[PDB]
């Protein structure tokens, strides 16, 4: 056959400040996107890159506020809304999954840029977001867990109310993936970056 087209294990996350992998959605077979967030010193404006959706910008406001409430949880800087414009790189933009799928991934990657601290790898995640730090449940997790099983990713983290969806599908894929239940975005923060601040 010659040349492979498809990648090895996570060799573009490689636990990183600027980038973070996140599971993504197509109804023809799921995928996973490494979102790239860089924190550059500027004037506190916003950017969007990837022919994106405005609701991603909205969730950036939300998770941005979640940072603005918890800087001393992570030693984060106390002014970046006037000092840092943000060039979030998600891939291909406003999802045909209408609105969000992995807002918690974007929040972790944006927090990774504001920390300049590395991520972790061999972890994938997807979820919906909110202002008060409440991860909101997802529907039909099979495609994300399929492609992560195809990604050789075995630590995959989910919203807490989807815990009853373990009881429906074949467990033989499920138990071969490690589960750490979360309800809050700060939980996937402290379980997704390499350092705690």
């Amino acid at each position: 056959l010659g040349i492979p087209r498809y990648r090895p294990d996570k060799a573009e996350t490689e636990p990183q400040v600027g980038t973070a992998q996140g599971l993504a959605w197509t109804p023809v077979g799921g995928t996973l996107l490494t979102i790239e967030v860089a924190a550059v010193p500027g004037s506190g404006k916003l950017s969007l890159t990837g022919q994106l959706g405005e609701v991603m910008k909205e969730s950036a406001q939300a998770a941005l506020t979640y940072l603005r409430a918890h800087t001393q949880d992570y030693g984060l800087p106390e002014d970046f809304y006037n000092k840092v414009d943000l060039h979030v790189h998600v891939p291909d933009g406003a999802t045909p999954k209408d609105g969000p799928s992995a807002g918690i991934t974007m929040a972790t990657a944006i927090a990774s840029a504001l920390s300049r601290r590395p991520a972790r790898m061999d972890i994938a995640m997807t979820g919906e977001v909110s202002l008060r730090g409440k991860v909101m449940p997802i529907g039909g997790v099979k495609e994300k867990l399929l492609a992560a099983h195809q990604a050789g990713i075995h630590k995959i983290v989910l919203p807490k109310d989807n815990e009853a969806q373990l009881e429906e599908l074949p467990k033989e894929v499920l138990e071969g993936l490690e589960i750490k239940l979360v309800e809050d975005v700060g939980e996937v923060l402290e379980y997704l970056l390499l350092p705690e601040p």
Binding site: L46, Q51, D85
Partner: protein, 144 residues
């Protein structure tokens, strides 16, 4: 500009220059939404209409001199343009499929190292071109 023409002299393709000065908005570069009479594509697509191929020798004029009075940067879109793969993700404000600039060769023209965009400090190697010597000016004089 003549150096870029000389690169085109190496490669035998179409040549072009267009100003990144005289920009204050994204919707000058891309088109506008079809939301009034006269919705036309911006500077980029018509600049591609200038070029008979999808492999030109592109010069970009005054990349260190731009403006944007709104969200984000067009220099972000210049990083998008610079990448052939991000030309499959290049945003369009009038069209709807990200036009591919793969074979479109890329060299830009600037005057400053101080004002260069932070979203374009990646993938750029700032090489200072010195001025010209009296000896050099006489050489260029009597030769060319």
């Amino acid at each position: 500009t003549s150096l870029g023409r000389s690169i085109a002299r190496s490669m035998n393709r179409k040549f072009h220059r267009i100003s990144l000065g005289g920009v204050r908005d994204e919707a000058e570069i891309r088109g506008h939404r079809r939301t009034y009479i006269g919705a036309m594509p911006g500077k980029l697509i018509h600049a591609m209409k200038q070029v008979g191929v999808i492999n030109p020798v592109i010069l970009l004029d005054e990349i260190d001199k731009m403006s944007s009075d709104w969200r984000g940067d067009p220099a972000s879109a210049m990083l998008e343009v610079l990448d052939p793969e991000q030309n499959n993700t290049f945003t369009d404000h009038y069209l709807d499929v990200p036009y591919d600039l793969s074979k479109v060769f890329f060299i830009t023209t600037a005057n400053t190292l101080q004002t260069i965009p932070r979203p374009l400090l990646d993938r750029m190697e700032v090489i200072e071109i010195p001025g010209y010597t009296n000896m050099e000016k006489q050489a260029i004089a009597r030769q060319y």
